[PDB]
Amino acid sequence: TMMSVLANALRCIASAERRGKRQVLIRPSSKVVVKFLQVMQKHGYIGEFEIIDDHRAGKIVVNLNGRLNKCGAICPRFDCTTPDFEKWVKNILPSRQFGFVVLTTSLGIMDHEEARARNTGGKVLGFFY
Amino acid sequence: DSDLSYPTVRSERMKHKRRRLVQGPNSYFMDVKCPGCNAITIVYSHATSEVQCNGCATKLCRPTGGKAMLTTGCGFRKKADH
Amino acid sequence: VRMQGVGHGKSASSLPFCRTPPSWLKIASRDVIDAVCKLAKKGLTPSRIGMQLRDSMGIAQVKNVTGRKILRILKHKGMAPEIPEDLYCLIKRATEMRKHLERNTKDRDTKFRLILVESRIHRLARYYKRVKQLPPTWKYE
Amino acid sequence: VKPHLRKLRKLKRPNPSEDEDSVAKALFELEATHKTLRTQLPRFHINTVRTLSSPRFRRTATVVFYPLRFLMLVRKIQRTLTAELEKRFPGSIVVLVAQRKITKRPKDVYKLQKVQRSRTSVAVFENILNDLIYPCDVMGRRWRCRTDGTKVMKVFLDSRDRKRVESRLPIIAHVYKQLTHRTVSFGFMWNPKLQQVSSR
RNA sequence: CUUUG
RNA sequence: AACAAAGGAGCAGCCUCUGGGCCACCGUUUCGGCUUUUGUUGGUUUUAAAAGUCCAUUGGAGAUUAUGGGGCAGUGUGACAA
RNA sequence: UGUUGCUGUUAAAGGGUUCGUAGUUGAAUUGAGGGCCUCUAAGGCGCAAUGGUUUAGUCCCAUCCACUUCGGAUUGGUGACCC
């Protein structure tokens, strides 16, 4: 059945950005999906988006640029600490330059740079290039 | 053309009722008058029973099909959805 | 996908976005609640009452006007069924099939089916003892 | 004592304000010889307090408050009463807003799940908006998130109601703002079933 | 009207 | 994120000021305990507080916290012999 | 030997089908505030006002050609637009 809501977003978005689409539909919705987009949207990976109401479960829409290459989730939601980060950055990202890893920390949902700066660890969530 | 947050008429009206961005109904109500009395009963377009005329009894519909079908000689106005 | 069979259905009902009741209705709360309980006295289950009430009175979703749902109404008046509709339905079905097999012993299809049914009974029952609504002394046969 | 300050709760009666009086009077005035059952209903009904909010617009925002238990008795008559008051007071719109009190998130798992859902922020705020644009209804909601992280909201009405409500809107927005401290915008549509949007 | 049956 | 609990009528619970009346409570497997003052100690009693309970009564709120509204005016009495 | 990190149509490998206990996994929701004071602060497709002389272009007037297929003029109107 439907297990992870999150990965049912980020898999869609990814694929569509290859296939040359300029917009995507994302059929379930969460309080997680929203936040994850808000992050990206700062930098310029995601251009805008809308949130449609149905009074049962929402739908979401996404705009696109061409500046995103891949995004995804790291499913079991492992744990990370203040030194630990460099493991994940050597692994999932292709470089220590332009990537980002996404985390859920004590403070809230953030991206690795921000995390290290404020000195929180936390669980992990997904990534985007 | 055809933004997915603001579609046309054509690109909605075709589709199955859960596959719109709205997920509305597909049905309406009506008013119906019998020859044998003066009354208005309020009846459901996909009724799926035989319904006895309000204050009379004779049946204003048959339950047949996926859309129910009025008994002959009974006049019917429609109603709003709003 | 189907619970213990196979099949994909999609036959369904989607009620409207607006949750406010129509303009044209000339009922109010009282009128509704009356008609509910009144028809319940015949021995209709919640399902049948709601269907009768859309086809005659034009009240679609009861919850919209009355401010509460069919089963709540009947519980408050003590007319709610002791063993809930959904499982009682199943039990009735199953018994009939068992009767048939007391005469038809070379039938095979029926018995494949009977398994599936009896299984389902259990699962429902166990969620009506997880959620308190049966005695813990409940048993099928 | 006054015969017309029994259309006001007990606790504002001894030493009332100015805008309070005008309203209270008007109800007591109406209460005789205005046909049937808006010459019984408003007896029961009382106001809690009042405010008068002043935008820079042509017209000003008269907002009432009355307590939540009279809600049922207001809805029926609501159309009528809104008319009658608009007559009296010139150059001001008029809106009737029921009075509600919210409970905040506790940050405890076990406390959270015992909260009465009706008085949570969402359902409150919804009802407030509905009370303003009473016959118009809400045919869709949406939220559009900008580059700047800044969420907006917008609400969609029915064209069938449009000519009536149309003028009022900027006022209504201003009112909703200074109550909730959230923003609202309004479109219309003309078919809600398939969902299109007015261009007219 | 300090009651009436 | 997990754990436990709920299964909604599994309730249909107003509050507060003041005055009056009555009233010992607490534990109890054959009456055991009792806070202060009257110089102090022992024995005895009266008085008050508080609690219980009823009645009268002040101001105020209500989103079942349920007045209010509606019914019988069956504990009954008094204000009309019109 | 594969937790990071394998393979299973034909190279070695999906068990004949189904029900089903322990075990593993499991949808959405209570929610993230505004006000005020400045800085070349990035934008308004919101609005008042002066400037357009083919010194922008386009509507609506004028006149003559014209059966497809004509263009001079009244800053026409700061309808509109730059700036």
Automatic annotation (TrEMBL), chain A:
Top-rank lineage group of the source organism: Eukaryota
Transmembrane segments: none
GO molecular function: structural constituent of ribosome
Gene Ontology cellular-component terms listed: ribonucleoprotein complex; ribosome
InterPro entries: Ribosomal_uS8, Ribosomal_uS8_CS, Ribosomal_uS8_sf
A GO BP entry: translation
PROSITE patterns registered for this protein in UniProt: RIBOSOMAL_S8
Keywords assigned by UniProt, alphabetized: Ribonucleoprotein, Ribosomal protein
Family, as annotated: Belongs to the universal ribosomal protein uS8 family.
UniProt name for this protein: 40S ribosomal protein S15a, putative
Source organism (scientific name): Trypanosoma cruzi (strain CL Brener)
From TrEMBL, chain B:
Domain of life of the native organism: Eukaryota
Gene3D superfamilies in the cross-refs: Zn-binding ribosomal proteins
Family: Belongs to the eukaryotic ribosomal protein eS27 family.
InterPro entries: Ribosomal_eS27, Ribosomal_eS27_Zn-bd_dom_sf, Ribosomal_zn-bd
Coiled coil regions, renumbered to chain: none
Cofactors named for this entry: Zn(2+)
GO MF assignments: structural constituent of ribosome
Annotated protein name in UniProt: Ribosomal protein S27, putative
UniProt keyword list: Ribonucleoprotein, Ribosomal protein, Zinc
Taxonomic classification: Eukaryota, Discoba, Euglenozoa, Kinetoplastea, Metakinetoplastina
Any Pfam family: Ribosomal_S27e
One cellular component term from this protein's GO annotations in UniProt: ribosome
Organism whose genome encodes this protein: Trypanosoma cruzi (strain CL Brener)
A single GO BP: translation
UniProtKB/TrEMBL annotation, chain C:
Species of origin: Trypanosoma cruzi (strain CL Brener)
Protein name, UniProt field: 40S ribosomal protein S13, putative
GO biological process: translation
UniProt-listed InterPro entries: Ribosomal_uS15, Ribosomal_uS15_arc_euk, Ribosomal_uS15_N, uS15_NS1_RNA-bd_sf
Keywords linked to the UniProt accession: Ribonucleoprotein, Ribosomal protein
Pfam families in the cross-refs: Ribosomal_S13_N, Ribosomal_S15
Keyword Ribosomal protein: yes
GO MF terms held by the record: small ribosomal subunit rRNA binding; structural constituent of ribosome
CDD domains: Ribosomal_S15p_S13e
PANTHER family named in the record: RIBOSOMAL PROTEIN S15P/S13E, SMALL RIBOSOMAL SUBUNIT PROTEIN US15
HAMAP family: Ribosomal_uS15_A (MF_01343_A)
SMART domains hit by this protein: Ribosomal_S13_N, Ribosomal_S15
Domain Small ribosomal subunit protein uS15 N-terminal: 1-59
Superkingdom, natural source: Eukaryota
NCBIfam families: PRK08561.1
One GO location term (cellular component): cytosolic small ribosomal subunit
Assigned protein family: Belongs to the universal ribosomal protein uS15 family.
From TrEMBL, chain D:
Entry keyword annotation includes Cell wall biogenesis/degradation: no
PANTHER family registered for this protein in UniProt: 40S RIBOSOMAL PROTEIN S7, SMALL RIBOSOMAL SUBUNIT PROTEIN ES7
Family matches, as Pfam families: Ribosomal_S7e
Recorded family membership: Belongs to the eukaryotic ribosomal protein eS7 family.
GO terms for biological process, alphabetical: ribosomal small subunit biogenesis; rRNA processing; translation
Record carries keyword Nuclease: no
Domain of life: Eukaryota
Entry keywords, A to Z: Ribonucleoprotein, Ribosomal protein
GO molecular function, a single term: structural constituent of ribosome
GO cellular component annotations of the record: 90S preribosome; cytosolic small ribosomal subunit; small-subunit processome
Official protein name in the record: 40S ribosomal protein S7
Annotated segments matching region Disordered: 1-20
Species in which this protein is naturally found: Trypanosoma cruzi (strain CL Brener)
